[PDB]
Structure 1
Amino acid sequence: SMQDPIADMLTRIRNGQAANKAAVTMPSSKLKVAIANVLKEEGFIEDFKVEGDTKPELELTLKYFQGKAVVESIQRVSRPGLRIYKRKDELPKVMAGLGIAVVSTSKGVMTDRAARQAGLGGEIICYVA
């Protein structure tokens, strides 16, 4: 059954980048809009738009720089089978800083740079490389 909708979202974006898809729709939630706002903020997607009233639908307009795709490798880190909670010192950098890692901290859903600057660790959701 669906047991990890975040990894489902990242799957939608990997398979949309891999199929030269212009835009990606999915069911929407607060955590997916938080992550999507981080992705737009860090420049991996072009835009997002949440529509619907009783059944919201998140839509990510994807990016393609050259013919190549911008989101090179998006991975889900803290899956439901095994959750991964890092401190502010253990908090990893991806592609030696060239690629953010979306961590859910108590202050909100941030990146690794932003939460290492904020001085607080948390639950590391996904590597975007």
Structure 2
Amino acid sequence: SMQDPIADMLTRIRNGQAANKAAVTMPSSKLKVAIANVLKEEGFIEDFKVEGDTKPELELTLKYFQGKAVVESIQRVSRPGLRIYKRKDELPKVMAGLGIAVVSTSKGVMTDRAARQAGLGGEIICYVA
């Protein structure tokens, strides 16, 4: 059964990019939307929208640059089978700073850079080189 919706979201992005799809779409959730925002604001996706009310659908718009896909890598880190939390001082650097770790802190989901500046640890959702 479906036991990791975030991993599903990341896989839709990874797979959508490899298929050169313009948009991908999925069942929405607060957290998926939270992650989409971080992706948008770091410029790994162009845009996103939640349409619908009873069964909301998240729709990410994917970015390409000189034909190639902008999201080179996107791996789930913390997962249901094995959760990963890091303190402020031991937050991961993805691609020596050139990528993001998306972190869930007590002040909401943000990049590892943002969590370092706030002085917050939290759950490592994913890497996005």
Tell me, yes or no, whether TM beats 0.5.
yes
Partner of 1:84: 84
Q: Deviations over 1:52-96 (max 9, x none)?
A: 110000000000011100000000000000000000011011000
Q: Deviations over 1:9-44 (max 9, x none)?
A: 000000000000000000000000000000000000
Structure 1 segments of 4+ aligned residues over 4 angstroms from their partners: none
For 1:48 and 1:73, locate their aligned partners in 2 and report how far apart those are by CA, in whole Å. 19
Runs of 5+ consecutive residues of structure 1 not aligned to the other structure: none
For 1:72 and 1:122, locate their aligned partners in 2 and report how far apart those are by CA, in whole Å. 24
For 2:125 and 2:68, locate their aligned partners in 1 and report how far apart those are by CA, in whole Å. 25
For 2:53 and 2:77, locate their aligned partners in 1 and report how far apart those are by CA, in whole Å. 31
Alignment of 1:26-105 (within 5 A): 26-105=26-105
Alignment of 1:1-40 (within 5 A): 1-40=1-40
Q: What root-mean-square deviation, in Å, do the aligned CA atoms of Structure 1 and Structure 2 show?
A: 0.3
Runs of 5+ consecutive residues of structure 2 not aligned to the other structure: none
- Alignment coverage as a number of residue pairs: 129
For 1:14 and 1:79, locate their aligned partners in 2 and report how far apart those are by CA, in whole Å. 17
SS in structure 2 at match of 1:48: strand
TM-score by length of 2: 0.99
The structural deviation recorded for 1:5 is 0.1
